[PDB]
Write a protein that binds this ligand. Structure first.
Ligand code: SF4
Ligand code: SF4
Lengths: 1016, 1016
């Protein structure tokens, strides 16, 4: 034999980069460290006066873009605030708490439903909202070092997944059918311009039931500025297409080529043609111009924003125009004038047209810039220059081209006046000049077509800023044309606002009234019709979710608000006879330590030393009667407890029955005996005690009752069997796990009661006991199949709840997930369950895990390029390897320019359920057939880990885990930090378990012969 | 009445509680604009007015962390192998290790590791231009949530250690001073008391040198860190802290003596017997221009070397004896340049009462040498940036500056910079500050460096690896050499030089050194705390060991674990030949017990791994070698047989003969029939455990411990059974039976073979700590003194101390290693020494271990305790934030005249005022607080109370009490400030969900308490 406890030489070399402890400080010269620094750099270099080449590169540059991994982390970080200030600062009043809650719970349909209910352009706004000036500007987490929440990127992700689902929008299912709709909803309605403002109005008017809505667009294309001028590298055009198709799912018609103009559409022709109401959303169609630039042409290199930006869009947004437009040749120095978000997008677009440098020249200072720093960041990092305090005076044209622009210095006084110093000039050499001063409405033929509505000092239509009504009651206006809004989201909200008051006007014109409280309908899809009801033990539940007997059911008044929120059923707090009344100590409910020092939302566990209800059985029985009177379709289960006393159990079970409880829950946490004949102290730990107690309750009541089991048993099957023999009609699995949540560093416990700082063993709830409760439910449902199981134990989403259903549970009680939140989580659970079952009917999404799409190769939540030279050549995303990636992409963006073909943006058509949408009964117990003994597991079918280096982020955790906890089977290249699984892999899967990039490591069938490591 | 319904007063308390919505909301765009300014938390892009910062030197760093923010960020760090952040740190700081220690709340271990490579670690963590250094190479850049705040984590851990008041000690590995070779008494001279010399002087003292002397020209120390770096980035008390640490090693500092020809010259040093010299005088003189000659401070002209010292002299208490005034800077201020210095002059100018600050540089924004950190502070303080401007003449009228005339610079075809004499800017200004850098121009200083070779930059030439000048005995480093730009690079230059200075001196005394540079680590009295412990007749050198699990798969892994410092180790469980097993794959999967958290810190793992696939021969030969090489490390052999007498005796004797210190009996073995619903495993029936313990106590003479299972009704029964059969102790506990979850389609994870089957696994990690903690406590109460080996979610010194306090002697670890690597042991051993050392410091009894008592903070920055801010209801948002900013600014003015800086504090280090406990002193001390529920006081009730200066207005306490409590909190609709009402019952749920550490506190109840009964 050799030395078994010493690594052989080639394993010694495997471990070369493995962490070892250190005995010394490490000598490294300040010089050497300077050159080694360049090998690992990830972020921009402060010594790079050089912008990498970006011509024809319209890839997503938004820093807010999120993948699933990133979006789940961020959603879990959000505090999900009451009266959340982020919503307060959202112009469309999105319930950001709710949709971010749905994202943490992996329910992206429910989040996207929340989003499009209040903003029909949620995916757009999620991408382009100046969140720092709006919702993120009010985020409570701004008061922490980690900072505010990326609200828009989360909203973009949840909306992106919903897009991929290809689910149509349906007509509001609360409405009557079209035939029995009152005549008023047949009113002919006209919208002018097909931008955000009108798309929002038409959608909200269709939601109300109006069945003849028409948007008249001037141009061959639709979407407004989101189509014509917002760059593709910030807003992909298929997003715009997607939100349009959603509105068209509601019957809104769009007619292009006809304009609001004299000798075209006028307010009068509309009135003559029978239109009962009109909304003006034509935007600001003309560019603000300077008399300095009179007579210049694009041939000389002059553009306005309204000239330049649509030219880049018509060429970089497939599906805009039948023309495969050529990108404009912009070779040289470019002067963009302006400081709104218009100018910054001509800046970044010029660099895409081949610009060699861009000067953003504005007439005021840096302090004075009108775009949000988000928009400014993308110009500054693409190395555009910034020239403040300069006003243009002459453009020098030589040889048919612009060759210079001469400015004068602008200045401020004491008065706050802005003058121009003639003596202080700047002759700035440039080849292209793009005025981006902004937009106006100046066309008389258009203003004339709006006769006789009133126009204000700014020659813009006056509107009641609360109803968006003009000086004619039947004509409304919103968005950029009003001069109030500066954003897509405020333009959307302007159409949202006008819709209800248009609905008010039209209904009044037909002799009908509307309610004094504006009620616009929510956003609906066929998912909302999925039947998530379930029957169990002879009781029908309207949804499988209910409140566990616990802190969220301390008072029955809280149960009423929960039923009012949508909860299917609820348990009373456990109550007993008067002689068994209790007093609680305090403190008695602490947060979990089970997942480290993470404070705030999503605690992984709680410990409680709380007893049963301090309130009386007289309170609970009268309460059960009141709640059953007002909520006949909401199951009310009274949880009860008595000593090991046949008279007591019989008397209390009879009283709770007479109160009208749909069922009973026998709390088996009551003691009897000393306690460890292998049977423990509590009744629920002894089979014979449980059999008798259930026998007694069976003799006493005629309603179904369930034994609530403790997990603190050697064999919970034996207890459940004992209840079934005793006559119970089901078991609730399980109560909390007996634990000690931890101690301070001085030895004292928490919770600590009184001056003595004493404690007792408490119960552990929450997701940290989910494997315990899931195991208990699985073994009961397999040992006693068909025996109804009410699952409790760390259920906090529709995805978790579905796992318990798959494991044999019929209904799902919740406690810790509400303590971590509030009662409204029920809405996320219900939409998440409707979504999960609906997706089971979609063939096209078979390659998904629930609401999660198949994780494609990505970096920073953006997909890595599928180029042949950029896959396989060992190129991690840092150091000199990243500069070569950026050169290969740039060259390949260039050969995709010198062949300007491929304009086939696929036509959107919805996915159709290919089998009946399963019911809750179609999934109960369907996972149990995969469970077995260990012998039923195949050791012939071994797997090995495989790593996707395009998704790897070079942390070497897999490397470390396999070395200090595995088989030393990963090589970690010392220059690229790229791991590679070798053939000594045993498939233990530990590396995958610790990889931070979702689906980077993958377990695949082993192809090379396997010999277990025996040592010998 | 109606009991299931809220009375009106409670209906009012619930006004802001969330409710599920049935309609989309109506809010006009105008109303949204007016409502947005009420919740705004961040700067408005519309406010151009600088906020008054006069005499405000409060911290303005965006990287400062408090404990709650630091703990989150250290947990988010992947703690990477071969970490690129460390390769980019000039001082090669082990970032992975010190951040791991922070994540485990071991702040001493982090600080010790930081100061081991960087004696100025607190300073560096505060001023580290991380984007161009360590954070520039961080892997988490490639994620959407971004690189790790390394400087903030360094600052926090270093700041906590600062507050501990623990001195640095001499290298304890050194011989006593008397027995030191005569060479170490060599007189060493260092010029300049800046970071370069402080580092070099510190590392020279660690090696053992006793006669070290720093010669500083001024009467202060610290170099630029004291003289020029502003107090709102680097406070002086930090510089004082680092100096006192160096002084702890005996380094001497003489102020007022200078390297100059009329004082200290190399000849005078050779004359006075000094045997080596280090030049760290930096660049003491400014880069001036001819444009400025004859311009005093009295005319409005400063250089950075003039202005910033006056401001530091005036804002850094204790830097000077002479109380100095804030320079009267009144009007427009031009700051010339764009280095790190220029932006400090701009920010310090606003502190002096500047009305307007213009930063003018001779190039563009793409050429700014300063870091994006630095630039942001001036940008967010409304400083104006003027590019492409070269100063040509200063206009002085009537004895003061009134304007500066500039010319427009531009880049040509070469890239060369030209001035355009024809394009001017007449910029009004009351003050000019040249920040063009620094030089060494003093000839008296240079002549004192004769005859060392100077280069074309007029700076000492040094071998960049040895820092040696042309004279062999003279070394140089820091800014004087010209390579360093940063404090950490100058620290590295001294670190570098100290080794080769060591070489030169030792050589000059006829002594050689190691060819491997080995600088000693940073040492405090904490490193001397004994953490050994004796148990069952065995001496453990520390209580931490590896559990029988994946980290002990091979003996070659146990060997590497011992080489890292692990006190003991269990072999993987091995068996006789006949019972050879074969694993399946996948078999180890990550836990879902804390939701979709990926990467570091998995709260649990689930495994279906069997015992070791390697033979008893391998493990027996391996134990022999391991114990022959590591006699002081305990090796316990884990063995398993079926329920069979001869087999248990054969295998236990074979492992004893191999030299095992002890045996661990794995009782996870199935027996025969099942019988009486009392588990299929041996460890679940106390009769079989007492028999197996009998049979092994038969075979062997060494101690043996029974590894107990937690999946039992009463673990104390199977523990007592072990103590009745043979056992010298018990290991509590093995893994918890569970199932970790299902994909949304029903298939499990792990999934074995094409059938996608699985079985019940074992749950490990921190999610079972409450179960393991409860088991160790019960066994310790029932069997006092019976040795317990603890297992179950030990992942830090703190968590291990909890198992020690609960009755355990040693601590087995598995999942924390799986989450990292073997070197966590060093974090554990440092943390345990710190936790025990601190128990002796009377000055820190108010701490929780290594966590200080939390004070009023926002973003981890002390709230100002001004009389006018408190008791007035001002949250940190909207108009309430401006009223606060107005209040601090009137107090920062009221503090300029109320002028006191003559009570500093002699930072005398804390001394142990009671013996440092040993492990034998803390075991079991938590058991006193444990007891039944009857032993808990229901008289000493508590109530919740909220510190509003700490609240971040999320409302979770409000929702948690509304939907999971007693509806006892008012949430004010205008301030979003909660207030706990008298109806509070002390349940403590609100404190448990609060994101802010210690914002809510449970206090004794003053008002009468009445249990809420609902009905009499
Ligand atoms: S560069 Fe400075 S802040 Fe960054 S890791 Fe090194 S010492 Fe710490
Ligand atoms: S949970 Fe904490 S931070 Fe949030 S409102 Fe309540 S007290 Fe304030």
């Amino acid at each position: 034999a050799p030395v078994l406890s010493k690594d052989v030489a080639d394993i010694e070399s495997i471990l070369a980069l493995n962490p070892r402890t250190q005995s010394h400080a490490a000598l490294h010269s300040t010089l050497a460290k300077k050159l080694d620094k360049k090998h690992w750099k990830r972020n921009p270099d402060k010594n790079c006066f050089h912008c990498e080449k970006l011509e024809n590169n319209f890839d997503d540059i938004k820093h807010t873009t999120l993948g699933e991994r990133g979006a789940l982390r961020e959603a879990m970080r959000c505090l999900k605030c009451a009266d959340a200030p982020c919503q307060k600062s959202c112009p469309t009043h999105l319930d950001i708490k709710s949709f971010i809650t749905s994202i943490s719970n992996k329910n992206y349909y429910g989040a996207a439903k929340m989003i499009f209910s209040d903003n029909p352009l949620g995916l757009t706004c999620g991408m382009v909202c100046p969140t720092s000036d709006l919702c993120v500007g009010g985020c409570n987490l701004y008061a922490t070092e980690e900072g505010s929440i990326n609200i828009g990127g989360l909203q973009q992700f949840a909306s992106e997944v919903f897009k991929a689902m290809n689910i149509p929008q349906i007509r509001n299912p609360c409405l009557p059918s079209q035939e029995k709709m009152p005549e008023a909803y047949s009113a002919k309605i006209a919208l002018l311009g097909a931008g955000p403002a009108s798309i929002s109005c038409a959608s909200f008017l269709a939601r109300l039931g109006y069945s003849d809505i028409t948007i008249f667009e001037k141009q061959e294309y639709v979407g407004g500025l989101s189509t014509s001028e917002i760059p593709q590298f910030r807003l992909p055009y298929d997003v715009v297409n997607f939100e349009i198709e959603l509105m068209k799912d509601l019957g809104v018609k769009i007619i292009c080529g006809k304009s609001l103009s004299e000798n075209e559409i006028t307010l009068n022709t509309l009135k003559e043609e029978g239109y009962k109401a009109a909304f003006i959303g034509i935007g600001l169609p003309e560019p603000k111009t300077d008399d300095i630039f009179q007579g210049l042409t694009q041939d000389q290199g002059f553009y306005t924003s309204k000239d330049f930006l649509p030219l880049v869009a018509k060429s970089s947004k497939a599906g805009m125009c039948a023309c495969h437009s050529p990108l404009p040749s912009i070779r040289g120095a470019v002067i963009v004038l302006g400081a709104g978000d218009t100018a910054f997008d001509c800046a970044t677009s010029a660099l895409r047209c081949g610009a060699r440098r861009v000067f953003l020249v504005f007439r005021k200072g840096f302090v004075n810039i009108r775009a949000v720093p988000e928009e400014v960041e993308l110009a500054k990092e693409e190395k555009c220059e910034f020239l403040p305090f300069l006003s243009p005076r002459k453009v020098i044209v030589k040889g048919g081209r612009i060759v210079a622009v001469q400015f004068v210095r602008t200045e401020q006084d004491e008065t706050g006046k802005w003058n121009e110093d003639e003596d202080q000039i700047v002759h700035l050499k440039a080849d292209v000049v793009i005025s981006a001063f902004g937009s106006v409405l100046r066309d008389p033929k258009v203003k004339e077509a709006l006769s006789p509505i009133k126009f204000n000092r700014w020659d813009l239509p006056e509107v009641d800023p609360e109803t968006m009504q003009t000086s004619e009651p039947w004509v409304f206006a919103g968005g950029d044309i009003v001069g109030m809004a500066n954003t897509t989201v405020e333009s959307v909200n302007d159409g949202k606002q006008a819709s209800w008051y248009i609905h008010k006007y039209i209904q009044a014109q037909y002799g009908a009234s509307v309610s004094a409280k504006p009620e616009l309908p929510l956003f609906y899809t066929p998912v909302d019709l999925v039947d998530i009801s379930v029957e169990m033990a002879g009781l029908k539940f309207i949804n499988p979710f209910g409140l566990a007997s616990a802190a969220p059911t301390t008072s029955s008044s809280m149960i009423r608000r929960a039923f009012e929120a949508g909860w299917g059923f609820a348990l009373t707090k456990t109550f007993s006879l008067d002689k068994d009344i209790v007093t609680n100590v305090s403190p008695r409910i602490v947060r979990g330590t089970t997942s480290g020092p993470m404070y705030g939302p999503g605690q992984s566990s709680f410990l409680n030393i709380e007893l049963i209800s301090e309130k009386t059985a007289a309170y609970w029985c009268q309460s059960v009667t009141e709640l059953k009177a007002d909520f006949p379709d909401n199951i009310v289960i009274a949880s009860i407890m008595c000593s090991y006393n046949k008279n007591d159990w019989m008397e209390l079970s009879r009283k709770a029955e007479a109160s009208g409880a749909d069922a009973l829950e026998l709390n088996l946490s009551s003691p009897h005996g000393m306690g460890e004949r292998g049977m423990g102290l509590a009744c629920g730990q002894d089979p014979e005690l449980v059999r008798n107690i259930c026998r007694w309750v069976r003799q006493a009541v005629q309603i179904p009752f369930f034994a609530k089991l403790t997990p603190n048993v050697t064999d919970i099957v034996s207890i459940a069997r004992a209840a079934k023999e005793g006559g119970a009609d089901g078991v609730t699995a399980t109560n909390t796990v007996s634990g000690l949540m931890g101690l301070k560093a001085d030895g004292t416990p928490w919770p600590a009661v009184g001056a003595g700082k004493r404690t007792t063993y408490g119960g552990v709830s929450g997701t940290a006991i989910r494997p315990i409760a899931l195991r208990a439910v699985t073994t009961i449902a397999r040992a006693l199949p068909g025996f109804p199981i009410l699952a409790t134990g760390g259920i906090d989403s529709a995805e978790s709840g579905l796992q318990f259903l798959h494991s044999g549970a019929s209904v799902l009680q919740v406690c810790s997930a509400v303590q971590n939140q509030d009662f409204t989580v029920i809405q996320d659970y219900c939409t998440g369950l409707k979504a999960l079952l609906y997706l089971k009917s979609i063939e096209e999404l078979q390659g998904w895990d629930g609401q999660s799409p198949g994780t494609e190769s990505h970096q920073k939540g953006k997909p890595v390029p599928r180029i042949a030279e950029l896959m396989g050549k060992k190129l991690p995303n840092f150091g000199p390897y990243l500069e070569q990636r950026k050169k290969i992409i740039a060259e390949e963006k260039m050969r995709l320019k010198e062949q300007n073909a491929a304009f086939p943006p696929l036509e959107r058509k919805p996915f159709i359920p290919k089998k009946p949408i399963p019911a809750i009964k179609d999934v109960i117990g369907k996972a149990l057939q995969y469970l077995g003994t260990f012998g039923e597991l195949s050791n012939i079918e071994q797997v090995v880990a495989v790593i996707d280096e395009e998704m790897c982020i070079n942390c070497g955790k897999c490397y470390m885990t396999c070395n200090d906890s595995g088989y030393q089977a990963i090589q970690f290249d010392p220059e690229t930090h790229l791991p590679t699984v070798t053939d000594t892999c045993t498939g233990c899967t530990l590396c995958l378990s610790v990889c931070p990039i979702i689906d980077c490591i993958r377990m695949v069938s082993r192809t090379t012969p396997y010999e277990p490591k025996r040592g010998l």
